Each structure stands twice: as structure tokens, then as C-alpha cells.
């Protein structure tokens, strides 16, 4: 079985490259971030523009939703993260402490902590309510490209240009495991699978890899796309067929069969690198976003 994703909407408004797109957990919204320093909120099903959220002084690399869809956190080159109330658009807290660009961020499932990663090679854990830093982890020896909590919040996975993937104990900040492969190419993205048993990691040698966390072993590799330059997000698609989804530096969205590793669809339409993709939590809908020549977000829908 292959999906049949087709273009339904194109979302214009950002004035520089889009850096990330994420669907709200309640499915109603898409949030986008951009090098233009702005966050924009859109309707997930019709692409209707809702509002612009502003406050960062430099471009934004990442945005993430809280579990209840009420808050966003953003990570900026201005060396801060900001927590936003989506309804009011107000900045609730500014998280200060990183000494260089903040590249990635996420809430835990409880949504009382935020994890961030930075060009300063550290991973920080922040209290959502106070906005203060709880722990600083000397996680890596090069910029940190992604950070993600597992399903019960007890673990954090981080990735870095140093070629390593590390798994951290949230409560203590101590390292539980280091994953290394081949000739340690930069790891540009990492996240836990929905059941927290696997880790999906992108490296800048045109390769995605699925790891068994408990055994520390590679189980699947996904190839065929172009990824040698940018930190491109990847996703598990779980609403219909079980796919792996990723953008690509040849301007396409790639979709693989998770078990067989075969490419099942390539979505054509963007006119620049597809830096970010997101999968809707209940519908067979993908959002994709592209760099400077394109600057748009596209919504695609499939029957399965």
C-alpha cells in the first residue's frame, strides 16, 4: 500500500525562509517559525491564516507546542527561548542562559519542562512556570541539532554535529547511553518513536536511521533523498500507513514504508530545500516548509 498525498493549500506570509512547522496536539492549528523572527499560526485543515506572534530579535530555528495546545516555545538566534500564550500572543517568559544560537526545543509530556539545544554545545532543561534554568548538560562537543523527550518524560535524546546521539536521564541530567555509527557524520536530527522504543536519527550523509534504544542497534536505514547541508526534520506518520516522512535538499518531500524502507511517494511542489515536515495527529495530513527561494508552507492530504 502507498499513500496518495496531494497538495491542498499553500500558506504564504513569511518574508524569509521557514525553519519549522508543527501541528498542535489537538489538531486544530499549524505553527510555523521563520528566519524573519516571526511565528505564524494557521488553521490545520484549511490553511487559514490566524495570527502572527512577534518578539524575538533574530531569526527562529524551532517552535514546539505544549501538551494542551495552549503554549508555544520558540528557539532563536537571539540566544533565548520564549514561551508564548497562543491565545493572547503574549510572551509569558524569556529563557536566558545559552551563550549562542538556540537551535531546538521541546516540551515534556507533562509540559512543565522545556529542553533546548544550542550552538554553545549544551542542552538545558527549563522550568516552564518560572522560566528559570534547572540544569545545564555539557552534552556535546559541537552544536546541538535536536532534543526530544520520550513518552513518559523520563528520558531526553540529543544529537549533534559532533556525530553523536546521546540519551539523558531527565531527573539527574546524567548520560545513559551514547549511539555512534559508521564514521560519525554530523547528526542533524533525532527523535523518539511514538512508543519510545526506537530513535530516528538523520545524518548529513543522505541517511536516516532507526535505532532500537534498549539494544543500542540500528534496525532500519532510509536512503534516496538529499541531506548533506541542513538540519531537516523527520517524522513518524501513524494516522494511516506507517511511514517515515522527511524533507530533502532536492525540494521534495520523501515518504518511506517504515518496515520495508522503500520510497512510497515523493511530493513535488516546493521550489527550495524542504527543511521541515510535520504529520497531523489524527488526519492523514502533512505540512511541509521550504527555504528562502520558496518561503511557503504546503498542506498535503492522503486517503490512507
Amino acid at each position: 500500500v502507498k499513500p496518495n498525498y496531494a497538495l491542498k493549500f499553500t500558506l504564504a506570509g513569511h518574508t524569509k525562509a521557514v525553519s519549522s512547522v508543527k501541528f498542535s496536539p489537538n489538531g486544530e492549528w499549524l505553527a510555523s517559525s521563520s528566519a524573519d523572527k516571526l511565528i505564524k499560526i494557521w488553521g490545520a485543515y484549511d490553511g487559514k491564516f490566524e495570527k502572527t506572534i512577534s518578539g524575538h530579535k533574530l531569526g527562529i530555528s524551532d517552535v514546539a507546542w505544549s501538551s494542551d495546545s495552549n503554549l508555544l516555545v520558540s528557539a532563536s538566534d537571539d540566544k533565548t527561548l520564549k514561551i508564548w500564550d497562543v491565545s493572547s500572543g503574549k510572551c509569558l517568559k524569556t529563557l536566558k542562559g545559552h551563550s549562542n544560537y538556540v537551535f531546538c526545543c521541546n516540551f515534556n509530556p507533562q509540559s512543565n519542562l522545556i529542553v533546548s539545544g544550542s550552538f554553545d554545545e549544551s542542552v538545558r532543561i527549563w522550568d516552564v512556570k518560572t522560566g528559570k534554568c534547572l540544569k545545564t548538560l555539557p552534552a556535546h562537543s559541537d552544536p546541538v541539532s535536536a532534543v526530544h523527550f520520550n513518552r513518559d518524560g523520563s528520558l531526553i535524546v540529543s544529537s549533534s554535529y559532533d556525530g553523536l546521539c546521546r540519551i539523558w536521564d531527565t531527573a539527574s541530567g546524567q548520560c545513559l547511553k551514547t549511539l555512534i555509527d559508521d564514521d560519525n557524520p554530523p547528526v542533524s536530527f533525532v527523535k523518539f518513536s511514538p512508543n519510545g522504543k526506537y530513535i530516528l536519527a538523520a545524518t548529513l550523509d543522505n541517511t536516516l536511521k532507526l535505532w532500537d534504544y534498549s539494544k543500542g542497534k540500528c534496525l532500519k536505514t532510509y536512503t534516496g533523498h538529499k541531506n548533506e547541508k541542513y538540519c531537516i526534520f523527520a517524522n513518524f506518520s501513524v494516522t494511516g500507513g506507517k511511514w517515515i516522512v522527511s524533507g530533502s535538499e532536492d525540494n521534495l518531500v520523501y515518504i518511506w514504508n517504515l518496515q520495508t524502507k522503500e520510497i512510497v511517494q515523493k511530493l513535488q511542489g516546493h521550489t527550495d530545500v524542504v527543511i521541515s515536515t510535520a504529520c497531523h495527529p489524527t488526519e492523514n495530513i502533512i505540512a511541509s516548509a521550504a527555504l528562502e527561494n520558496d518561503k511557503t508552507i504546503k498542506l498535503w492530504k492522503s486517503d490512507c
Partner: peptide, 5 residues
């Protein structure tokens, strides 16, 4: 940021 090489 992420949008730059």
C-alpha cells in the same frame, strides 16, 4: 539559524 548553511 537552521535556514543557513
Amino acid at each position: 539559524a537552521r535556514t543557513k548553511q
